Design an enzyme around this catalytic site. Structure first.
Site, mmCIF file in Angstrom:
data_model
loop_
_atom_site.group_PDB
_atom_site.id
_atom_site.type_symbol
_atom_site.label_atom_id
_atom_site.label_comp_id
_atom_site.label_asym_id
_atom_site.label_seq_id
_atom_site.Cartn_x
_atom_site.Cartn_y
_atom_site.Cartn_z
ATOM 1 N N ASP A 138 9.034 -6.372 -4.305
ATOM 2 C CA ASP A 138 10.435 -5.849 -4.196
ATOM 3 C C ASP A 138 10.352 -4.516 -3.468
ATOM 4 O O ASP A 138 11.422 -3.885 -3.284
ATOM 5 C CB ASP A 138 11.028 -5.629 -5.547
ATOM 6 C CG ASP A 138 10.821 -4.424 -6.310
ATOM 7 O OD1 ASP A 138 9.502 -4.476 -6.728
ATOM 8 O OD2 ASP A 138 11.516 -3.531 -6.596
ATOM 9 N N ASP A 183 3.938 -8.211 -7.997
ATOM 10 C CA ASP A 183 3.991 -6.747 -8.343
ATOM 11 C C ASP A 183 4.769 -6.684 -9.718
ATOM 12 O O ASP A 183 5.422 -7.170 -10.151
ATOM 13 C CB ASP A 183 5.114 -6.445 -7.003
ATOM 14 C CG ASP A 183 5.496 -4.760 -7.492
ATOM 15 O OD1 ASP A 183 4.542 -3.859 -7.761
ATOM 16 O OD2 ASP A 183 6.698 -4.643 -7.321
ATOM 17 N N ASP A 185 4.776 -3.583 -0.646
ATOM 18 C CA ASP A 185 4.743 -5.265 -0.971
ATOM 19 C C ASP A 185 4.703 -5.753 0.420
ATOM 20 O O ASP A 185 4.410 -7.054 0.544
ATOM 21 C CB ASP A 185 5.556 -5.744 -1.848
ATOM 22 C CG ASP A 185 5.232 -4.998 -3.333
ATOM 23 O OD1 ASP A 185 4.030 -5.181 -3.819
ATOM 24 O OD2 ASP A 185 6.125 -4.564 -3.856
HETATM 25 F F1 ALF Z 1 4.168 -2.638 -8.992
HETATM 26 AL AL1 ALF Z 1 4.738 -2.358 -7.018
HETATM 27 F F2 ALF Z 1 5.043 -2.206 -5.468
HETATM 28 F F3 ALF Z 1 6.437 -2.483 -7.506
HETATM 29 F F4 ALF Z 1 3.051 -2.373 -6.536
HETATM 30 MG MG LIG Z 2 8.050 -3.062 -6.947
#
Ligand code: ALF
Ligand SMILES: [Mg+2]
Ligand SMILES: C[C@@H]1CC[C@@]2(OC1)O[C@H]1C[C@H]3[C@@H]4CC=C5C[C@@H](OCCC(CO[C@H]6O[C@H](CO)[C@@H](O[C@H]7O[C@H](CO)[C@@H](O)[C@H](O)[C@H]7O)[C@H](O)[C@H]6O)CO[C@H]6O[C@H](CO)[C@@H](O[C@H]7O[C@H](CO)[C@@H](O)[C@H](O)[C@H]7O)[C@H](O)[C@H]6O)CC[C@]5(C)[C@H]4CC[C@]3(C)[C@H]1[C@@H]2C
Ligand SMILES: CCCCCCCC/C=C/CCCCCCCC(=O)OC[C@H](COP(=O)(O)OCC[N+](C)(C)C)OC(=O)CCCCCCC/C=C/CCCCCCCC
Ligand SMILES: CCCCCCCC/C=C\CCCCCCCC(=O)OC[C@H](COP(=O)(O)OCC[N+](C)(C)C)OC(=O)CCCCCCC/C=C/CCCCCCCC
Ligand SMILES: CCCCCCCC/C=C\CCCCCCCC(=O)OC[C@H](COP(=O)(O)OCC[N+](C)(C)C)OC(=O)CCCCCCC/C=C\CCCCCCCC
Ligand SMILES: CCCCCCCC/C=C\CCCCCCCC(=O)OC[C@H](COP(=O)(O)OCC[N+](C)(C)C)OC(=O)CCCCCCC/C=C\CCCCCCCC
Ligand SMILES: CCCCCCCC/C=C\CCCCCCCC(=O)OC[C@H](COP(=O)(O)OCC[N+](C)(C)C)OC(=O)CCCCCCC/C=C\CCCCCCCC
Ligand SMILES: CC(C)CCC[C@@H](C)[C@H]1CC[C@H]2[C@@H]3CC=C4C[C@@H](O)CC[C@]4(C)[C@H]3CC[C@]12C
Ligand SMILES: CC(C)CCC[C@@H](C)[C@H]1CC[C@H]2[C@@H]3CC=C4C[C@@H](O)CC[C@]4(C)[C@H]3CC[C@]12C
Ligand SMILES: Nc1ncnc2c1ncn2[C@@H]1O[C@H](COP(=O)(O)OP(=O)(O)O)[C@@H](O)[C@H]1O
Ligand SMILES: *[C@@H]1O[C@H](CO)[C@@H](O)[C@H](O)[C@H]1NC(C)=O
Ligand code: NA
Ligand code: NA
Lengths: 982, 266
Positions: A675, A334, A679
């Protein structure tokens, strides 16, 4: 769907009225028809069932059979009176071993969690609903589909709603996209995707500001967040790669044991043997072939590694997760909060026809760009004076880029930039009194402020403004260069053009800054200003500079990505953010290399269509969620195979899980770092899930096997190296524990087929198993690397097994046979020195064990009673035990390296090896002279020479292994290396 | 894999042949230190065991005098053991020597060396056995309810028994008594028949020189008859040998003594 229908069509589909709402009778009828608006928790298996399932896992089934055979042998030995009472001890020990191994396995298995318990502080408790034309505050669990509800600022949306009336509504969809940027809400169908529509409010999301009215369209587990929670709880029940390797090793050992037992029972019954001799031999085969302490030792080593890694701020929730990092070939990461800091900071500045780079570190106290003092004093004054954001009370000694700020994200970035550069921002603002202020609105797209200068020499009016670069330029007529004004032209309106597009092509939001000094004649000291855009001028300003902001990468992230890629790991960015920012962040962190280009970069650099450029000239790919939506699984497989650098942008949690599954379909072990709530399905589906500690959400941390407590991405490289060392040391431990099995098994085979008096007992070998080499087995886990462990490639999951044919063959047919011969030498020495020459022992077993014969004649003519023969048998058993210990010392020495020499690696560098050697010697001494002083458990006191008879055989074992490894090193890739290296 | 099968089979044949050769060589090196005339140690055998004839199972002697098939196994065992003590079996004057009919001191026939040739052996006369030799009573006291047992001391190389100090200094005493106070009254009157009328083992049959220096060796015997056993009861008898060189153990029930349980039915 519901976002395309009009208000009237929504009132017919759901049988509702926006003005009146649902009735109180239809509300209860729909609550009965659909159920409450709550998330149903997942069904978890009982703890006692999980504990009991570990009593039949591993080698426990074979040990249960051994204990049953022990009981069936004792009942036979009791029907025909035999004062043995030795099979009950063996059966009890086997049952105790099963129980202890099951306890260790239960402690090793992954803990159960309900991630839906982290979807708790986001769920609203009450909801303002319209029923019977009267607004009342009901509980959100009583909401039904088709209900009209009201939401305000600082409110959690009570359900998935279709906004029918809205006034300045903004929401936070970070639980869906991972992005905390406020999203404008309206009542008009804006985009086809329901997750990007501007007229749907989502359950368990925050309404940041404004008011709205909506009709409930989904409730409970039918919501977006309910489906996310269900998907997270469903997937992720597979076995870790280390569990599969252990299962394969168990299958190999159990198959070998079963085959040997079947063969040597079928031949034994045909050798004129009766049932008791055929079943005691089966018990001996089972006990000798099974490593009774190896699995508990593996659990202990995993615990030791987890405890070591917890000291580097890396929490390991699952014991088996310490190995998965190390066999991982793909990392799906992520972007926001994981790779980046999740904080908007000033990135670039454009003034004086120059582009400057600003420091974007989390821990920074200075800015090193060229502060020329010309046009920079003006830019700094505009930055400091045209900001409404202020720090929060109670934060004075906190680092500037860590303090909490009330205000917009863009204003927070500018405030922190000004505080870092200038040090005093509030005082400077206080000195320049603010007498007028036009606040920022989305319609105006700028912010105005009139101030009074802190120059007693002048005391004029300074009106500063910031806003969108195009609006600022079209409201500007002169520019400031090198601290001097300058009229606009095509030379400075095109440099601005190019700079704006250069900054905007980096995924950064640009802001334009300008000011104006009001004349002292037509604007005297009083001149009360009207905020109605009447009294003061709002044109012909003086442009100063451009500032762009980005959520920047963490300091340790680009180096960690580079090291992971150098370790042979594929790094894929999977984000819910927009592709332009994602691509720039990927280039910054090294996910996309500088030389490599996408299929659109080549088209732009060649001034052709995107279909002209071959898709094989491009080395990087940026794929959006809508591109991935129309992708067939074969198309995804081809995309993953053909590209080493891929960025997935604007993806839903379902799409993240789809990408992880597609990566796993390529026979790969996949790590996922995230995070956020979005996710969690991918963190659960991945072989290892790693969450961030400070920046991570509770849902992400519950779904993860590992938590980075300090948000340090460099912990990933350390974990990969530790896992790679664990996998290499576990081979050594397994080989060491498997070597002794053949040395324990050969005496029983010789005892059965040759009729020798029993060289060693079944109870005796259990002491070798559970008491003598437990500490050496643990000691083999502290070995260091033989070569550069981070310079290899990830092992193939289907081709690089933990236990292969080479390891088993070298442990069984090479060193185990040597150990058996070394023990038999001491056996014959012990027997011959009392009167029984080695030839006289053949077929002597039947008369040896006859209790009624008390004058058995030896090789000298002396006559032996039954008890003295028993004592000599126990002495030979103790000598065999000691010989096995002495040869296992050399086995420990040689099993501590696989290619290197003891001279190259060092003999005393690993002190746990010498602790294990001392433990072996001490345990053998206690058994021989503690339990030998009173003859118990077939142990007797030995003579001094019986401790040293088998030393030359151990030296021979060490010599053989040293020469084998020497010739492996001398000729790499030869016949010897291919066939002799395990 | 074709041709590499020959190479791997050759490696394994050579490796296993070398392993076998090293094992055999170590065995030869160990056996070079082993004498063929006297054992290296006598830790387990030096305090001799006391063993009786006939060889029985569970230590029980149980028979019915009126049925010849109840004691046939006992009589056959006694005959098989005593067949080597026949007068015709000890007629070779180059092998057997006529030591005295009275107890004497141990006969030192030299040292445990291959020189001096094979050592001569004292003769033991079956007539000394008495009422239990089979010369007159072919059933060895059985068939009449008066069973005979033959007591022997386990053979130990170079072992010279030491009778306890005061009576006869050249006889190792042996006594048989009821085990418990219940058996001490029902056992009857124990009859002993040894060489020269002494109850024990004459010392001139010692030391034993081994099966290679002293083949055809005859260890001394001591027959014991009971002749007054209470019928239809199980009498537990303990026969013990006494001497300074003779020791006993609680774990080894046949060291310097033994147990026999005799029941003569009606
Ligand atoms: F970039 Al993310 F959940 F923090 F897809
Ligand atoms: Mg994130
Ligand atoms: C009559 C019968 C006959 C038998 C008998 O009697 C009976 O007679 C006797 C005959 C005896 C043997 C004689 C000889 C050896 C070899 C020795 O082990 C080699 C020594 C090693 C060096 O050790 C260094 O250790 C220190 C470290 O600081 C040095 O400083 C210091 O100089 C030196 O000591 C060999 O190392 C080399 O290994 C590779 C080449 O092979 C080279 O590449 C490597 O390095 C690469 C990076 O460069 C990497 O890619 C990889 O690691 C890799 O590729 C490497 O460079 C090169 O050094 C281990 C002992 C043994 C088996 C003896 C046992 C006992 C006997 C069988 C007796 C027995 C009683
Ligand atoms: C003087 C007395 C001599 C007595 C000799 C008696 C005969 C014994 C000989 C056995 C014949 C050969 C056995 C093996 C045959 C090949 C099996 C095989 O190729 O299997 C298929 C695959 C092979 O792939 P891999 O796992 O190697 O690759 C792992 C990946 N990597 C290498 C990257 C880590 O593996 C699998 O499916 C799993 C199977 C792997 C393990 C097979 C069993 C190996 C055990 C051998 C011990 C046998 C004797 C036991 C003790 C007897 C006491 C007297
Ligand atoms: C206690 C003292 C122990 C002393 C012995 C220790 C054992 C190890 C020591 C020596 C073993 C032999 C020497 C090492 C192996 C040969 C090395 C060699 O010269 O290169 C390998 C050759 C040819 O390689 P290539 O051209 O295909 O490579 C091409 C590579 N590229 C393609 C990259 C160019 O392959 C070949 O000739 C293979 C020929 C067949 C190999 C086995 C023959 C019999 C060997 C028995 C050794 C063990 C005896 C028993 C020990 C008992 C100890 C107790
Ligand atoms: C792994 C590769 C194979 C390794 C084993 C190879 C085969 C070895 C088996 C038998 C060969 C033994 C030959 C040793 C050399 C003896 C030469 C000889 O002159 O012969 C006579 C000896 C006995 O001499 P004596 O005491 O009567 O001397 C009388 C006078 N004195 C005391 C005064 C000096 O005969 C003896 O050595 C006694 C022979 C007893 C045979 C027992 C067989 C089992 C024992 C050990 C084998 C362990 C194998 C483990 C792996 C099995 C497969 C899974
Ligand atoms: C905790 C206190 C002990 C309590 C336990 C009871 C006694 C345990 C006894 C263990 C003996 C282990 C083997 C003998 C060790 C001798 C000590 C020694 O002085 O060795 C020194 C060498 C050098 O070692 P280095 O690494 O300094 O190299 C430096 C050389 N340069 C710089 C060229 C690379 O050690 C070597 O390499 C050669 C290593 C040879 C290993 C032989 C293994 C087979 C032996 C089996 C006997 C088991 C009993
Ligand atoms: C590190 C080197 C290990 C070598 C193995 C033997 C251990 C030698 C190490 C000794 C150092 C510690 C032990 C100190 C005591 C040793 C002296 C000893 O007490 O030695 C015992 C036996 C010889 O007994 P003896 O003749 O003194 O008995 C006297 C009784 N009387 C007079 C009736 C014959 O030595 C034997 O068994 C030796 C037979 C075993 C040979 C195995 C093959 C070795 C070849 C390679
Ligand atoms: C001397 C005799 C006993 C040798 C017999 C060889 C036997 C014991 C070994 C050699 C190859 C081994 C097999 C190799 C492959 C497999 C497949 C694996 O999924 C289960 C174990 C199993 C089935 C092993 C069982 C044990 C095995 C059959
Ligand atoms: C009694 C003695 C001579 C026989 C001992 C077995 C030796 C000679 C040979 C017989 C067949 C051989 C196996 C044949 C093929 C394979 C598969 C390969 O992937 C690993 C090595 C391995 C497993 C070989 C190891 C050595 C082996 C087991
Ligand atoms: N203080 C400010 N904070 C944020 N944006 C500002 C500010 N002043 C001017 N702007 C400009 O207003 C533009 C529009 O802001 P807004 O309507 O809130 O969101 P969006 O940029 O997503 O349309 C910004 O992109 C920026 O260029
Ligand atoms: C036992 O010996 C004596 C010696 O006189 C003899 O009279 C008697 O008949 C014998 N009895 C038996 C049981 O043979
Ligand atoms: Na075992
Ligand atoms: Na996981």
């Amino acid at each position: 769907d519901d976002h395309r229908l009009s208000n009237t069509e929504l009132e017919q589909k759901y049988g509702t009225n926006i003005i009146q709402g649902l009735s109180s009778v239809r509300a209860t009828e729909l609550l009965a028809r659909d159920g409450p608006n709550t998330l149903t928790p997942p069904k978890q298996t009982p703890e006692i069932i999980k504990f009991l399932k570990q009593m039949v896992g591993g080698f426990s089934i074979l040990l249960w059979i051994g204990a049953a055979l022990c009981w069936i042998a004792f009942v036979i030995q009791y029907v025909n009176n035999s004062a043995s009472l030795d099979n009950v001890y063996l059966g009890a020990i086997l049952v105790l071993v099963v129980i202890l191994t099951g306890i260790f396995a239960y402690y090793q298995e992954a803990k159960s969690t309900n991630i839906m318990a982290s979807f708790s502080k986001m769920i609203p408790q009450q909801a303002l609903v319209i029923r019977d034309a009267e607004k009342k505050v009901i509980s959100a669990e009583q909401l039904v589909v088709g209900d009209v509800v009201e939401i305000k600022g600082g409110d959690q949306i009570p359900a998935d709603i279709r906004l029918v009336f809205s006034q300045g509504c903004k929401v936070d969809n970070s639980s869906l996209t991972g992005e905390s940027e406020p999203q404008a809400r309206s009542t008009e169908f804006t985009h086809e995707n329901p997750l990007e529509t501007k007229n749907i409010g989502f359950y368990s999301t925050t309404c940041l500001e404004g008011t709205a009215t909506g009709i409930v369209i989904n409730t409970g587990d039918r919501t977006i967040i309910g489906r996310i929670a269900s998907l997270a709880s469903g997937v992720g029940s597979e076995k870790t790669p280390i569990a599969i390797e252990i299962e394969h090793f168990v299958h190999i050992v159990a198959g070998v044991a079963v085959s040997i037992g079947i063969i040597f029972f079928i031949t034994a019954v045909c050798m004129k043997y009766y049932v008791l001799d055929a079943i005691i031999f089966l018990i001996s085969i089972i006990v000798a072939n099974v490593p009774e302490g190896l699995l508990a030792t593996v659990t202990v080593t995993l615990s030791l590694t987890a405890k070591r890694m917890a000291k580097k701020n890396c929490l390991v929730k699952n014991l088996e997760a310490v190995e998965t990092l190390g066999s991982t070939s793909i990392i799906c990461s992520d972007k926001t909060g994981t790779l980046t800091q999740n904080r908007m900071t000033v990135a670039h500045l454009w003034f004086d026809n120059q582009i400057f780079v600003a420091d974007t570190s989390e821990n920074q106290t200075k800015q090193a760009f060229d502060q020329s003092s010309g046009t920079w004093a003006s830019l700094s004054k505009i930055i400091t004076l045209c900001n409404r954001a202020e720090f929060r009370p109670g934060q004075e000694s906190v680092p500037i880029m860590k303090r909490t700020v009330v205000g917009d994200a863009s204003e927070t970035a500018l405030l922190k930039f000004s505080e870092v550069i200038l040090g005093d921002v509030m005082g400077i603002r206080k000195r320049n009194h603010k007498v007028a202020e036009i606040p920022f609105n989305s319609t105006n797209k700028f912010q105005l402020s009139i101030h009074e200068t802190e120059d007693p020499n002048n005391k004029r009016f300074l009106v500063v403004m910031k806003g969108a670069p195009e609006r600022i330029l079209e409201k500007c007529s002169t520019i400031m260069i090198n601290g001097q004004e300058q009229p606009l032209d095509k030379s400075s309106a095109d440099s601005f053009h190019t700079a704006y597009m250069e900054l905007g092509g980096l995924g950064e939001r640009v802001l334009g800054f300008c000011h104006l000094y009001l004349p002292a004649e037509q604007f005297p000291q009083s001149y009360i200003f009207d905020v109605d855009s009447v009294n003061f001028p709002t044109s012909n300003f003086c442009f100063v500079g451009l500032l762009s902001m980005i959520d920047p990468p963490r300091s340790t992230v680009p180096d960690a990505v580079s090291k992971c890629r150098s370790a042979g790991i594929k790094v894929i960015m999977v984000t819910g953010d927009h592709p332009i920012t994602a691509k720039a962040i990927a280039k910054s962190v090294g996910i996309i290399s500088a030389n490599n280009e996408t299929v659109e970069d080549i088209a732009k650099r060649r001034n052709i269509a995107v279909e002209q450029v071959n898709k094989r000239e491009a080395k990087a790919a940026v794929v959006t969620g809508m591109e991935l939506k129309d992708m067939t699984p074969e198309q995804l497989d081809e995309l993953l195979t053909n590209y080493q650098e891929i960025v997935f942008a604007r993806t839903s949690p379902q799409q993240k899980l789809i990408i992880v599954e597609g990566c796993q379909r390529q026979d790969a072990i996949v790590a996922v770092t995230g995070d956020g709530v979005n996710d969690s399905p991918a963190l659960k589906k991945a072989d290892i899930g790693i969450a961030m500690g400070i920046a991570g959400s509770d849902a992400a941390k519950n779904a993860a096997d590992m938590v980075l407590l300090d948000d340090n991405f460099a912990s990933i490289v350390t974990g990969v190296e530790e896992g790679r060392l664990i996998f290499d040391n576990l081979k050594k431990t397994i080989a060491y524990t498997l070597t002794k099995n053949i040395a324990e098994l050969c005496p029983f085979l010789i005892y059965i087929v040759a009729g020798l008096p029993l060289p060693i007992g079944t109870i005796t070998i259990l002491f070798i198993d559970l008491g003598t080499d437990i500490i050496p087995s643990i000691a083999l886990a502290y070995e260091k690397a033989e070569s550069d462990i981070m310079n290899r490639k990830p092992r193939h999951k289907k081709k690089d097994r933990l236990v292969n044919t080479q390891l088993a063959i070298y442990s069984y047919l090479h060193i185990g046979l040597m150990q058996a011969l070394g023990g038999f030498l001491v056996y014959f020495t012990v027997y011959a020195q009392q009167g029984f020459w080695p030839t006289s022992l053949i077929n002597l077993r039947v008369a040896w064990e006859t209790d009624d014969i008390n004058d058995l004649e030896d090789s000298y003519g002396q006559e032996w009673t039954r008890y003295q023969r028993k004592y000599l048998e126990w002495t030979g058993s103790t000598a065999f035990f000691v010989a096995i210990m002495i040869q296992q010392i050399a086995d420990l020495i040689i099993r501590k390296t696989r290619r290197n020499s003891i001279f190259q690696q060092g003999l005393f560098r690993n002190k746990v090896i010498w602790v294990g050697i001392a433990s072996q010697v001490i345990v053998a001494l206690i058994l021989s002279y503690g339990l030998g002083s009173v003859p118990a458990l077939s142990f007797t006191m030995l003579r001094v020479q019986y401790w040293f008879v088998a030393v030359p055989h151990a030296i021979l074992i060490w010599v053989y292994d040293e020469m084998r490894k020497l010739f492996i090193r001398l000729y790499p890739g030869s016949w010897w290396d291919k066939n002799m290296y395990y | 894999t074709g041709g590499s099968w020959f190479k791997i089979l050759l490696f394994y044949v050579i490796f296993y042949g070398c392993l076998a050769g090293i094992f055999i060589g170590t065995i030869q090196v160990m056996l070079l230190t082993i004498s063929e005339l006297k054992p290296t140690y006598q830790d387990r055998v030096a305090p001799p065991g006391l063993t009786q004839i006939p060889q029985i199972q569970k230590t029980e002697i149980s028979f019915r005098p009126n049925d010849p098939k109840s004691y046939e196994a006992y009589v056959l065992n006694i005959i098989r053991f005593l067949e080597k003590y026949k007068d015709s079996a000890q007629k070779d004057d180059m092998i057997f020597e006529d030591c005295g009919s009275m107890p004497s001191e141990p006969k030192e026939r030299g040292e445990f060396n291959h020189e001096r040739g094979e050592r001569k052996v004292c003769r033991f006369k079956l007539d000394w056995l008495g009422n239990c030799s089979g010369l007159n009573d072919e059933s060895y006291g059985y068939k009449e309810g008066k069973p005979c047992i033959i007591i022997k001391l386990n053979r130990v190389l170079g072992f010279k028994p030491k009778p306890p100090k005061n009576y006869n200094p050249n006889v190792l005493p042996v006594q048989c008594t009821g085990k418990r106070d219940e058996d001490k009254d029902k056992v009857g009157n124990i009859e002993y028949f040894g060489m020269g009328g002494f109850y024990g083992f004459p010392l001139q049959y010692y030391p034993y020189y081994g099966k290679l220096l002293q083949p055809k060796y005859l260890q001394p015997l001591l027959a014991v008859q009971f002749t007054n056993l209470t019928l239809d009861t199980e009498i537990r008898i303990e026969c013990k040998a006494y001497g300074e060189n003779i020791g006993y153990s609680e774990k080894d029930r046949f060291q310097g003594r033994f147990d026999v349980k005799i029941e003569v039915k009606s």
